[PDB]
Design an enzyme around this catalytic site. Structure first.
Site, mmCIF file in Angstrom:
data_model
loop_
_atom_site.group_PDB
_atom_site.id
_atom_site.type_symbol
_atom_site.label_atom_id
_atom_site.label_comp_id
_atom_site.label_asym_id
_atom_site.label_seq_id
_atom_site.Cartn_x
_atom_site.Cartn_y
_atom_site.Cartn_z
ATOM 1 C CD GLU A 173 48.797 -80.721 39.155
ATOM 2 O OE1 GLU A 173 47.622 -80.601 38.729
ATOM 3 O OE2 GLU A 173 49.057 -81.305 40.236
ATOM 4 C CG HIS A 199 36.986 -90.404 49.301
ATOM 5 N ND1 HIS A 199 37.688 -89.259 49.607
ATOM 6 C CD2 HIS A 199 37.832 -91.193 48.608
ATOM 7 C CE1 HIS A 199 38.915 -89.348 49.134
ATOM 8 N NE2 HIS A 199 39.027 -90.524 48.547
ATOM 9 C CG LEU A 200 31.379 -86.065 49.547
ATOM 10 C CD1 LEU A 200 29.859 -85.893 49.712
ATOM 11 C CD2 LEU A 200 31.977 -84.771 49.013
ATOM 12 C CE1 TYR A 201 39.690 -87.707 53.913
ATOM 13 C CE2 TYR A 201 39.477 -86.716 51.755
ATOM 14 C CZ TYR A 201 40.100 -87.585 52.599
ATOM 15 O OH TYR A 201 41.171 -88.382 52.232
ATOM 16 N NE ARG A 243 46.206 -94.047 43.925
ATOM 17 C CZ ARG A 243 46.148 -93.652 45.205
ATOM 18 N NH1 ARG A 243 45.261 -94.149 46.043
ATOM 19 N NH2 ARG A 243 47.037 -92.721 45.587
ATOM 20 C CB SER A 244 42.096 -92.392 45.733
ATOM 21 O OG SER A 244 41.709 -91.679 46.915
ATOM 22 C CB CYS A 245 37.866 -89.205 43.434
ATOM 23 S SG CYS A 245 37.043 -87.639 43.046
ATOM 24 C CG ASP A 246 38.810 -84.450 48.755
ATOM 25 O OD1 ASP A 246 37.652 -84.021 48.669
ATOM 26 O OD2 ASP A 246 39.636 -84.005 49.599
ATOM 27 C CE1 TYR A 255 49.044 -88.592 38.710
ATOM 28 C CE2 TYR A 255 49.978 -87.087 40.318
ATOM 29 C CZ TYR A 255 48.978 -87.980 39.934
ATOM 30 O OH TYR A 255 47.958 -88.254 40.813
ATOM 31 C CD1 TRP A 268 52.129 -80.480 42.351
ATOM 32 C CD2 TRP A 268 52.677 -82.429 43.337
ATOM 33 N NE1 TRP A 268 51.447 -81.514 41.699
ATOM 34 C CE2 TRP A 268 51.787 -82.705 42.303
ATOM 35 C CE3 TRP A 268 53.164 -83.456 44.153
ATOM 36 C CZ2 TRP A 268 51.344 -84.000 42.028
ATOM 37 C CZ3 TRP A 268 52.754 -84.757 43.862
ATOM 38 C CH2 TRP A 268 51.843 -85.002 42.812
ATOM 39 N NE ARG A 313 49.072 -101.273 21.761
ATOM 40 C CZ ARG A 313 50.088 -102.137 21.762
ATOM 41 N NH1 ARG A 313 49.974 -103.316 21.162
ATOM 42 N NH2 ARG A 313 51.233 -101.828 22.353
ATOM 43 C CB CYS A 348 45.015 -89.546 42.783
ATOM 44 S SG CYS A 348 45.554 -89.452 44.532
ATOM 45 N NE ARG A 376 50.010 -94.494 54.655
ATOM 46 C CZ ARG A 376 51.175 -94.461 54.017
ATOM 47 N NH1 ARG A 376 51.317 -93.818 52.860
ATOM 48 N NH2 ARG A 376 52.223 -95.085 54.549
#
Lengths: 264, 264
Positions: free
Chosen positions: B58, B207-209, B166-169, B94, B80, B127, B146, B21
């Site tokens: 956390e 992903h990997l930056y 959903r999104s992982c560094d 969360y 945070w 469930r 995330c 983003r």
């Protein structure tokens, strides 16, 4: 299909004995993932004949958002009949969450329009998600969503989609779960002028019922046939304007259908 | 760890060029799954030193449900800080969803107590889920979750847990995501008198930056060391009564820590 038969064999080889809510025993594993490149062909199981008429109408009905089964009954689709009450109501299952998720402040959120908008205007987004797991509405639903949430992703002109399925009956439901979401990827891609990417299937409690053991062994003795091809005969003006007759499956040459019963 | 290094290499070998983003480029794949048998050892990356002090605080803070960062600040945990407003608020991230998911009718649902109750009284349930993906509250959150949803499962006296992220560094966040949920499985299992099973990690946009490429190559040249062991020094009366000092990691012998920067 190769991945599907591999999952079947895996449940047989390492699933643990586990009952369902009814008390019907199963063999189950927790956590599995499969990937179907939609450019390889439409991922419809070929080791048993699988009918899609009900699945196509169900997807259209999901997209429309009304959870009463009237539209399904108009087309003689009876797969939701066992959960519907006397008026044909199911409570706020799938479609109501996809199209009108209720918020605490009285809004109804259309997740399908949100994701379409996100795919057209912000394709890199890592939050292009649709969830049917509305915690506050679970009690009112005829049953909690099995295909609970799904995420979209765009790379190199291709649309991919991952589904998280909390509970999967490998023999009876899985073939239809895959086809349903695969169809939806084709429809979303068409509406966003994208090619189809991969459909990633992720499972939670993934099982084979014990009364499906003969059927599982028979299916496992069959060799997968080449996948069929999905053809969309028309391009509607929006994702809500698809019609049953728009879809055609070409080149489907399955081994014979195999019946599997359910306990009550 | 073997699975973690395999994922790194996979992103490098087949990830596609993709921006975030902010506009920072990444290499990314969509859909991945790893399994950690918690009886094999606590799954803390050994190919770089990973600190858990912030992660433990956390998790306790998540479990407590208040999303203001005061408790983190009381313990000098600053992870945070970049998302908090002037009063220390983050919106209903969360913890608010885990402990007090707001419904349209004005109730606040405690998902953690619900799942604990389900693990003790209906362990076969398919469930047993916690979701932080509250569609109606996303706009108010400092950022969308995330680690979006997770499901529990019980088989042969063991508690397993699957997380959908959903999104992982992969470089900066993944090691901590794994450790966090692994810790929570140990705590839930202890509270339900169960042994630990597997932690299944499922990823969306993984992903990997690009500015982590040197670090990734260095880490990939190191051999994983034996996993450490989690010891819980005390058994609290409930899942909400754990304290920082209750946890001890034994036998952690990592390769040196590796710094990775972020763009703004």
């Amino acid at each position: 299909m190769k991945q599907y038969l591999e999952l079947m064999q895996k449940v047989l080889d390492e699933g643990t004995q586990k009952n369902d809510r009814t008390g019907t025993g199963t063999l189950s594993i927790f956590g599995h993932q499969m990937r179907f490149n939609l450019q390889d062909g439409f991922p419809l199981v070929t080791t048993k004949r699988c009918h899609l008429r009900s699945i196509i109408h169900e997807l259209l009905w999901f997209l429309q958002g009304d959870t009463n089964i009237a539209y399904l009954h108009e087309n003689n689709v009876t797969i939701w009949d066992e959960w519907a009450d006397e008026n044909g109501d199911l409570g706020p299952v799938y479609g109501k969450q996809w199209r009108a998720w209720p918020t605490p402040d009285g809004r109804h959120i259309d997740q399908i329009t949100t994701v379409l908008n996100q795919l057209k205007n912000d394709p890199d987004s890592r939050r292009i998600i649709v969830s049917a797991w509305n915690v506050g509405e679970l009690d009112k639903m005829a049953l909690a969503p099995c295909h609970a949430f799904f995420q979209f992703y765009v790379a190199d002109g291709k649309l991919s989609c991952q589904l998280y399925q909390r509970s999967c009956d490998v023999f009876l439901g899985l073939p239809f779960n895959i086809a349903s979401y695969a169809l939806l990827v084709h429809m979303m891609a068409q509406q966003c002028d994208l090619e189809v990417g991969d459909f990633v299937w992720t499972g939670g409690d993934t099982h084979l019922y014990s009364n499906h053991m003969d059927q599982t062994h028979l299916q496992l003795s069959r060799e997968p046939r080449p996948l069929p091809k999905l053809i969309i005969k028309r391009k509607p003006e929006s994702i809500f304007d698809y019609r049953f007759e728009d879809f055609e499956i070409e080149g489907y040459d399955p081994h014979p259908g195999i019946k599997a019963p359910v306990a009550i």
